[PDB]
């Protein structure tokens, strides 16, 4: 995360860390959506050009970790199975950059571990509007090094026409961009390592946090004129339901 701040303890209890089992290596962010289902970006697990084509046994996930070992707070889980979106377009623009990982053992919720909510239709309509701000969190790059504390930044959702104009990459209805415009006064953006990390919004209908996006791509980090892109979670929920309800 670029130009953000340290997270407060318990601020993002749904935060999940995806690690490469051996050699131990942090790969991406992810988020807890239940006691046994975790969301992340497909490119975090499948992206041939970078030699990424992981098997479930290739990784592990860490939950409730405040630093880069809290013996009694954080949880370390193995994966039962990975599910990458069938129409994930990795060769072109990263269309439908989403994936689900099912843990071998459900995890017990706590003060430091709890699931983020997945948007319903009216929550999304109302919250997904240009100018409204959301929150990105991650253990990724601080600049185009890495933090020892989970980072956070709030960024405004940008109008589709403007997102399109910011980049030559072909953007889809399955993505959205969020960030400040150079004339806006504030900065911030996700960066390498942050993929899979949640972009959340708090709903006044019920004071609950909802994950509206997944950190997917960008060009450079916190560059003036550029805006980070996120996987449009809601438009892909039916796939989520299909998978989960097997």
């Amino acid at each position: 995360i670029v130009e953000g701040s340290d997270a407060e303890i318990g601020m993002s209890p749904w935060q999940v860390m995806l690690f490469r089992k051996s050699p131990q290596e942090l790969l991406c962010g992810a988020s807890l959506i239940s006691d046994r289902w975790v969301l992340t970006a497909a490119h975090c697990l499948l992206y041939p050009p970078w030699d990424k084509n992981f098997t479930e046994n290739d990784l592990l996930v860490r939950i409730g970790k405040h630093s880069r070992y809290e013996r009694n707070i954080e949880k370390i889980s193995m994966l039962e199975k990975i599910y990458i979106h069938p129409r994930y377009n990795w060769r072109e623009n990263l269309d439908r950059d989403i994936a689900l990982m099912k843990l071998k053992k459900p995890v017990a919720f706590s003060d430091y571990i709890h699931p983020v909510c997945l948007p319903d239709r009216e929550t999304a309509a109302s919250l997904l509007q240009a100018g409204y701000k959301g929150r990105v969190t991650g253990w990724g790059n601080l600049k185009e090094g890495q933090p020892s504390v989970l980072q956070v930044v709030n960024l405004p959702i940008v109008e589709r026409p403007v997102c399109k104009d910011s980049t030559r990459i072909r953007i889809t209805d399955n993505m959205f961009c969020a960030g400040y415009k150079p004339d806006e006064g504030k900065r911030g953006d996700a960066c390498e390592g942050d993929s899979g990390g949640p972009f959340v919004m708090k709903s006044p209908f019920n004071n609950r946090w909802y994950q509206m996006g997944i950190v997917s791509w960008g060009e450079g980090c916190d560059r003036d004129g550029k805006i980070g892109f996120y996987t449009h979670v809601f438009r892909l929920k039916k796939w989520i339901q299909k998978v989960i309800d097997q």
Partner: peptide, 26 residues
Amino acid sequence: ADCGLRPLFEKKSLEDKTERELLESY
């Protein structure tokens, strides 16, 4: 439906240091 309610914040009726920025944007 036990989701999106942080034990150390929502549950203790405490607000984090920046969540008001989100409310302001609405």
